[PDB]
Amino acid sequence: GKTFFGQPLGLSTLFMTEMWERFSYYGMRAILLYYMWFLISTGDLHITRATAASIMAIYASMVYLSGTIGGFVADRIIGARPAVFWGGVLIMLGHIVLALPFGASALFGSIILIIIGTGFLKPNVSTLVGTLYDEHDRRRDAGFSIFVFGINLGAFIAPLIVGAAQEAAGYHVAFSLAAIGMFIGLLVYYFGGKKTLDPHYLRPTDPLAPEEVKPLLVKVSLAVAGFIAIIVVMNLVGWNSLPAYINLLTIVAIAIPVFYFAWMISSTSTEHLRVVSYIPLFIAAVLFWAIEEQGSVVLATFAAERVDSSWFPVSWFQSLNPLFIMLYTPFFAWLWTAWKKNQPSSPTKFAVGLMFAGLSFLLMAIPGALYGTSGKVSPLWLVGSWALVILGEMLISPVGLSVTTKLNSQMMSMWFLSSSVGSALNAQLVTLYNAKSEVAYFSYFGLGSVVLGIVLVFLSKRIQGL
């Protein structure tokens, strides 16, 4: 009868829920870097612009890492529906914290709230989408495709609205708009959810058995103690600068997949050989996400310093990324179906995807080389870059989780960890970007990325077999 684009009505609630949460997230991202610059310019915030960029990168990295944990907490301890709700409350608080007349002092509280909040909400709204379908219901793919379109929608309009607001009424009003975005999300989620969602997901679906509670408690406490202990030693030997902490978070984010790789490989020999073949794919994913995650940092810097954008808010460039996702998506949907005969392998898609990413940086090296780096250049250079990298994303992401799974639960999380690892790498790399290094930065990381894409093409055939 009455459906939401063919799908159960309950999909409309989750569609809107995520649309507004993503609105709140990307509205904030579009101006947070400029906000840190602002706070630097007034002497309120005592860091370099390069450190500000580094913060942006490690922030994303922690958001993605947080998300690989929220599923477990909801499944085992609090339930999917409460996770989404309190996750949204924490996200809203994080934005409210930035709307207050405080300054640089609120930055950390804001960041922690949103890292925890997002990590609760984000995997669990996906989970709730799945629960709308019987599991042999073929509509499922369509429904997720629709859900994703809502995600891209929020990411698309947020910089336009929040950025304009920032221009009209300043940073605190613009951040309050992100808060209101999340609030709307919660409103629709709460009341819409009660009508359409199974009450079963009010509770955990795999609750802790009595003998499971102690070891989990022991597990968590040790990790905290260690982490605290590392921070203590760090300060005793004088490694207590913001860059040092960012470095520590970088190490933790890299170590997690490195430890997992070291585990599987050490610990079925043919099962082993498939795991070793994934390492090239994982590296490729990491490098790809790095370049893509620099849209909000390095391309954002470029947009503000090198582009003549005197007639519109420079944060609007952050809308090109989800615009191109939305434009490309129904195309590539049609493409794979039409292309039945000799479809490229998922490892081949990874390689070519990395090349396009690499091309997107190589493109950006041209205006500096041709025109110099002291003037301003056309907005279209950036438009071409995002067009190139998102073309890369269409090849890598839709097959990404697929390639990892067919090659367990730790490996499954490893795909979602590639975007965290890429951002952690960025936290180091983006500090190398400035006006003097511009052309070398784009060239080097552009070319290297294309080369590794070439290497992966050579390696593609053996991985296909496995």
Ligand X SMILES: CCCCCCC/C=C\CCCCCC(=O)OC[C@@H](O)CO
Residue 398's CB is within 10 A of a number of other CB atoms, namely 17
Positions 57 through 96 that interact with ligand X (CB under 6 A)? 58-59, 62, 65-66, 69, 72-73, 77, 81-82, 85, 92, 96
CB of 202 to ligand X, least distance (A): 6
In sequence order, what are the beta bridge partners of 7? 4
Q: Give dist(CA 21, CA 155) in Å, integer.
A: 9
- The DSSP secondary structure of 124-158, one letter per residue, reads HHHHHHHTTS-TT-TTHHHHHHHHHHHHHHHHHHH
Burial classification of residue 202, based on how many CB atoms lie within 10 Å of its CB (0-12 exposed, 13-18 middle, 19 or more buried):
middle
Contact 164, 313 (CB under 8 A): yes
Q: Which residue is nearest to ligand X (CB)?
A: 384
Single out the residue of 347, 335, 420 nearest to residue 66, CA to CA.
420
Chain discontinuities in the chain, listed by preceding residue (C to N exceeding 2.5 Å): 267, 407
Interface residue with ligand X, options 207, 215, 330, 375 (CB under 6 A)? 207
Q: Is 172 in the site for ligand X (CB under 6 A)?
A: yes
Question: CB under 6 A: which stretch of 138-146, 241-249, 269-277, 403-411 binds ligand X?
Answer: 241-249
Contact 360, 331 (CB under 8 A): no
CB of 237 to ligand X, least distance (A): 9
CB of 458 to ligand X, least distance (A): 5
Which one, 14 or 148, has the nearer CB to ligand X?
14
Interface residue with ligand X, options 252, 264, 276, 407 (CB under 6 A)? 252
Annotated binding site for L-glutamine: 22, 26, 122, 419
Q: Is 190 in the site for ligand X (CB under 6 A)?
A: yes
Contact 368, 438 (CB under 8 A): yes
Q: Give dist(CA 392, CA 284) in Å, integer.
A: 11
Question: CB under 6 A: which stretch of 23-31, 293-301, 332-340, 454-462 binds ligand X?
Answer: 454-462
Q: Is 355 in the site for ligand X (CB under 6 A)?
A: no
Annotated binding site: 22, 26, 122, 419
State residue 4 phi and psi, 5-degree precision: -100, 95
Helix 346-371 to helix 438-465 angle (10° resolution) is: 170
Q: Is 41 in the site for ligand X (CB under 6 A)?
A: no
Interface residue with ligand X, options 6, 44, 168, 170 (CB under 6 A)? 170
Q: Is 222 in the site for ligand X (CB under 6 A)?
A: no
Annotated binding site for L-glutamate: 22, 26, 419
- The DSSP secondary structure of 219-232, one letter per residue, reads HHHHHHHHHHHHHH
Helices (H), 339-408: 346-371, 380-406
Interface residue with ligand X, options 15, 261, 381, 416 (CB under 6 A)? 381
Six-digit token pair at 392? 């890369």
CA 26 to chain centre: 10
Interface residue with ligand X, options 153, 359, 430, 463 (CB under 6 A)? 359
- What contacts 50, CB < 8 A, 6 or more positions away? 430, 431, 433, 434
State residue 7 phi and psi, 5-degree precision: -110, 165
Interface residue with ligand X, options 55, 60, 355, 411 (CB under 6 A)? 55
Contact 338, 328 (CB under 8 A): no
Q: Is 350 in the site for ligand X (CB under 6 A)?
A: no
Q: Is 107 in the site for ligand X (CB under 6 A)?
A: yes
Q: Is 283 in the site for ligand X (CB under 6 A)?
A: yes
Which one, 222 or 251, has the nearer CB to ligand X?
251
Length in residues, the chain: 466
Question: CB under 6 A: which stretch of 106-114, 130-138, 396-404, 409-417 binds ligand X?
Answer: 106-114
Which one, 1 or 348, has the nearer CB to ligand X?
348
Positions 298 through 317 that interact with ligand X (CB under 6 A)? 316-317
Q: Is 333 in the site for ligand X (CB under 6 A)?
A: no
Q: Is 39 in the site for ligand X (CB under 6 A)?
A: no
Question: CB under 6 A: which stretch of 12-20, 128-136, 138-146, 238-246 binds ligand X?
Answer: 238-246
Buried b (16+ CB within 10 A) or exposed e, 403-436: bbeebeeebebbbbbbbbbbbbbbbbbbbebeee
Interface residue with ligand X, options 251, 265, 335, 451 (CB under 6 A)? 251
Q: Is 327 in the site for ligand X (CB under 6 A)?
A: no
Q: Is 109 in the site for ligand X (CB under 6 A)?
A: no
Question: CB under 6 A: which stretch of 134-142, 243-251, 392-400, 409-417 binds ligand X?
Answer: 243-251
Positions 114 through 153 that interact with ligand X (CB under 6 A)? 115
Q: Give dist(CA 25, CA 95) in Å, integer.
A: 9
